Ligand SMILES: O=C(CSCc1cc(C(F)(F)F)cc(C(F)(F)F)c1)Nc1ccc(Cl)cc1C(=O)O
């Protein structure tokens with residue numbers, strides 16, 4: 001429909017510039033005839049999910065790289081892709097004029113955009129808030145008589161969530177995560193620093209905190225929002241650390257195990273929200289598989305845990321087989337889900353680097369690594385930030401796929417946005433990862449999936465500067481002959497029947 005308006009900020013690629021009356025977009029999804037394939041391409045040189053089509057060939061000769069689909073090697077099914085409606089994101093979006101807000105929301109959630117189907121919702125304040133608050137700040141209110149949603153929810157996050165769901169054609173799933181409890185539930189009496197829940201699982205502090213989850217879900221249900229899942233706590237290991245600067249609530253794995261078994265699981269299960277899923281961990285994958293063993297080998301906790309949520313800081317490259325892989329091996333029926341990731345903390349770089357192609361590549365490289373190790377979904381952090389990477393009450397600024405420039409009634413879609421969309425637009429909920437084997441060593445990241453309707457999707461990221469010729473073999477249809485430009489990302493789609 002409308003192409004990227006490119007702007008360079010002097011980094012290696014461009015942003016796409018959007019405002020009240022213009023934003024780049026897609027025509028309605030139009031599917032390739034049998035015997036042909038669709039290609040979407042994004043390049044550092046400036047191409048932005050450009051559509052092309054080509055033929056599937058009956059035969060193939062050559063010594064070039066061959067990727068063979070193995071459609072009967074079946075792995076995980078996909079839940080979805082999306083990002084976090086933090087106070088900061090909601091505040092930034094709503095500071096735009098209304099027509100610009102709608103183009104920003106459509107970019108993420110419309111079929112004219114990249115089809116997000118997950119929204120992560122903080123339960124009260126986090127560092128990407130402009131102030132600290134919980135939903136029950138009256139001291140020692142164990143009955144939660146004064147539990148209340150503030151304007152951050154009722155005027156910023158909830159109205160935006162409603163509009164995102166209105167624009168989406170696919171069902172959107174909401175995921176909720178708390179950063180801190182009320183300070184009067186905590187050993188240290190503060191929203192941050194080293195501190196856990198007072199007392200012992202089963203007792204009044206732990207029951208009150210479990211009930212706070214139900215009150216949150218009650219309150220959101222009164223606003224006609226229902227949740228797919230909640231996490232047990234955001235980054236529980238953070239609250240074990242002296243001086244931790246951000247809202248947090250410490251749990252060892254044993255404390256999480258017992259809080260879930262004694263308080264949170266039973267309280268949710270006996271509520272009208274018993275169908276909400278409970279995810280554990282919601283923390284750096286370096287804590288796996290130990291955290292998973294502690295919680296899931298206790299059947300009184302395991303019966304309440306639907307899944308394991310993981311974070312990653314994309315400024316780092318770290319092991320995945322030994323953490324995600326070994327965890328899946330131990331607990332193959334407990335899904336892994338990436339609930340938060342971000343980039344932009346290296347001291348020698350801007351927190352927001354407008355046009356960074358490297359940062360886009362770190363998104364898709366992470367997404368592909370996650371999918372190759374059983375992860376069912378991938379959730380970005382802030383849906384939008386200002387050009388400083390905020391606001392953030394502790395000045396912990398990072399990057400975001402959409403950057404809002406309030407003074408200009410403009411927003412910029414970063415390479416990260418398009419690297420996300422190469423997955424989110426083309427991998428609907430229920431898609432299943434399948435096998436994909438390489439004929440020789442290569443510098444590509446690739447993953448293959450089958451949609452629910454049977455058709456195929458392959459994402460190829462070229463980590464190198466060289467163009468790489470490659471062929472994809474699908475025994476049902478033949479050969480897809482193509483080239484992967486250096487640094488590029490491609491998504492291929494084709495019918496199989
Ligand atoms: O997380 C990491 C990744 S290890 C470095 C590494 C090794 C290799 C390999 F040798 F394997 F090829 C390739 C790459 C590549 F990404 F460039 F391709 C990077 N390291 C850091 C991360 C952040 C900061 Cl600030 C410092 C460090 C640090 O290690 O100095």
Ligand SMILES: O=C(CSCc1cc(C(F)(F)F)cc(C(F)(F)F)c1)Nc1ccc(Cl)cc1C(=O)O
Pocket residue numbers: 313315316344345346347348
């Ligand atoms: O030691 C520190 C202070 S802890 C913060 C930290 C450490 C590292 C780590 F060193 F662990 F890699 C990486 C990052 C990240 F921003 F990349 F995520 C942040 N910082 C660095 C030390 C050396 C260098 Cl080269 C850079 C930094 C830097 O802060 O950017």
Ligand SMILES: *[C@@H]1O[C@H](CO)[C@@H](O)[C@H](O)[C@H]1NC(C)=O
Pocket residue numbers: 005018019020021022
């Ligand atoms: C918004 O962007 C479009 C496309 O570049 C441009 O034609 C229009 O003038 C812009 N509007 C404002 C107010 O800058």
